[PDB]
Amino acid sequence: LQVAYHXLFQXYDNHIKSSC
Amino acid sequence: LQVAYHXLFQXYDNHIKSSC
Amino acid sequence: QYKLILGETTTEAVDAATAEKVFKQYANDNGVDGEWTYTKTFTVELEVLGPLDPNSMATYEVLCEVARKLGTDDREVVLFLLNVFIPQPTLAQLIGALRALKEEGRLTFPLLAECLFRAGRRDLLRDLLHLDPRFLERHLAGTMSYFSPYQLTVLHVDGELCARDIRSLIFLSKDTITPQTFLHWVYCMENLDLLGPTDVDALMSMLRSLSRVDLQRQVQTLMGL
Amino acid sequence: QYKLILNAVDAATAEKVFKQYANDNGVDGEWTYDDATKTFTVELEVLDPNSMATYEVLCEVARKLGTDDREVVLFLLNVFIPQPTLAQLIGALRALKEEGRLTFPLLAECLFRAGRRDLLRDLLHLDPRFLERHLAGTMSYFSPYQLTVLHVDGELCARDIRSLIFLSKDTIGSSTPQTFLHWVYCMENLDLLGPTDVDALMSMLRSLSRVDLQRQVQTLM
């Protein structure tokens, strides 16, 4: 869950970073 | 109202045309 | 038989649990999400993507009244111009497809106006859409068309081809088949990948073998070099 | 007194205030008001759970932030208020979230740059050892200028910032700055400092004898 929470955060961060 | 309806249609058409 | 209250929607289910699953899916499909109370009836309080609901349902009236007064060959023109085309459709096929486009946002009011204009239904623009066709023809003069030059070419050829030529077209199409109209022949060739916006050589090959060299030259003029 | 159940000089004004409060929040249900109990009740919504349950994170973050960290966060999130209070910060953060500007990954880096790795581990549940590695190979949410001013702020001492206010009196203006980030905000408004020209920052650092900090700004940009 912890490693998955860190994974999910990276996914969400990369998503906003890939927008603009 | 009729001339305004024709005006409104042109505004809406020009709006979708000014997108892509 | 099972009832749903929002909009009195009814279904036929094997058991009560299946009816709840079918109705819960219909809730998301529409967008409404209220408290469920399940006699043989189920009632739903909240929504997302009263006044707004009435407007959405009312907008459909324009499309329902348009589709019901469209008629056999105009159905093909409209469905061809709105990409997803069905050969020789019925009211239930067209009404469904137009509603599937409206829910997908692919259909707009100015697009529907030009769609009805190209169809030749200036009567429906005047009476149902309340748009003066004398103004609409002037509007389209200085505005980029919603439809491709290929889409508009096929539509022009369709108008000039006679009943005898389209009968002969079906006989010549038997070498690649069956179609019942020229727009049906186009759809068959588009699926077979012989016709398309890039080539159009197959359209000219048929028009040369139908003696409509005037129509063959018209396609050549509409496409160029 | 007039009440509003969610699901003034007179009742007419009270109704207007509540009707506008519903649209502002996004809600739009059926209105039923009682003239004896002095209460109004509200169906539909189109603007609910986390869009309300997320704010709990922001509230706990802001309440445990503290005086000087408030300035860092508000500076990094553009709209900065000099020496803010809980009511000023909580209001500004909730305004940004409602505007869509504030995001969770932005808030994480915002709390990281602030130096509140304790709040990342405890409140945001993000391991700062991982976050520092994440920020290594990822483009920062904040400008090199934003990050420079923040770095200078950290290295400047209590005596230098006292001397900074004395030197700022030539461009002030009583109200006068109370911190270096307050001095930056005053200069940004006066249009002497900015991301394009940091000459004013280096002019102050040269006249504060922090040539090491002046060289660091030059090295940074």
Numbering used by the authors:
A (entry chain S), B (entry chain R): 230 to 249
C (entry chain B): 2 to 7, 14 to 45, 49 to 54, 56 to 60, 63 to 69, 101 to 221, 226 to 273
D (entry chain A): 2 to 8, 20 to 54, 56 to 60, 66 to 69, 101 to 223, 225 to 271
Give the authors' words.
One such protein is KSHV vFLIP (ks-vFLIP), a cellular FLIP homologue that targets the canonical and alternative NF-κB transcriptional pathways, rendering them constitutively active. The core IKK complex consists of the kinase subunits IKKα and IKKβ together with the essential modulatory element IKKγ (also referred to as NEMO), which is the target for ks-vFLIP. By means of a physical interaction with IKKγ, ks-vFLIP is able to “lock” the IKK kinase complex into a persistently phosphorylated state via a mechanism that appears to be independent of known upstream cellular activators, such as Traf2, Traf3, Traf6, LUBAC, Tak-1, and HOIL-1 (17), and is thus distinct to those resulting from stimulation by endogenous proinflammatory cytokines or cellular FLIP variants. Pivotal to complex formation are amino acids within the region of IKKγ spanning residues 230 to 248 (a dimeric coiled-coil) that are accommodated within two clefts of a ks-vFLIP monomer.
Inspection of the ks-vFLIP–IKKγ structure identified Q236 and E240 as potential sites on IKKγ for an i, i + 4 staple given that they are nonessential. Based on these findings, the modified peptide (spIKKγ) was subsequently synthesized with an added C-terminal cysteine to permit future conjugation to cell transporter molecules or fluorophores. To address this, we cocrystallized ks-vFLIP with spIKKγ. The overall configuration of the ks-vFLIP–spIKKγ complex revealed a heterotetrameric arrangement analogous to that observed in the ks-vFLIP-IKKγ(150–272) structure, where both peptides contacted clefts 1 and 2. As indicated by our modeling studies, the ks-vFLIP–spIKKγ binding interface mediated by cleft 1 showed a high degree of structural similarity to the original ks-vFLIP–IKKγ(150–272) crystal structure. Crucially, the H235, F238, E242, and K246 quartet, central to binding and subsequent NF-κB activation, form similar contacts with the cleft 1 region in the peptide complex. Also in common with the ks-vFLIP–IKKγ(150–272) heterotetramer, there were few specific interactions between spIKKγ and cleft 2. Notably, however, the aliphatic staples replacing the side chain moieties of Q236 and E240 (though only partially ordered) pack alongside the aromatic side chain of F53 located within the interface between clefts 1 and 2, where they form van Der Waals interactions. Our crystal structure of ks-vFLIP bound to spIKKγ reveals that its mode of interaction directly mimics that of IKKγ in the original complex to the extent of forming a heterotetrameric ks-vFLIP–spIKKγ assembly with conserved interactions in the spIKKγ-spIKKγ interface. In keeping with a high affinity, the apparent dissociation constant (Kd) of the vFLIP-IKKγ interaction in the presence of peptide increased approximately 80-fold, from 380 nM to 30 μM. This corresponds to a Ki of 257 nM and is thus comparable to that of IKKγ(150–272).
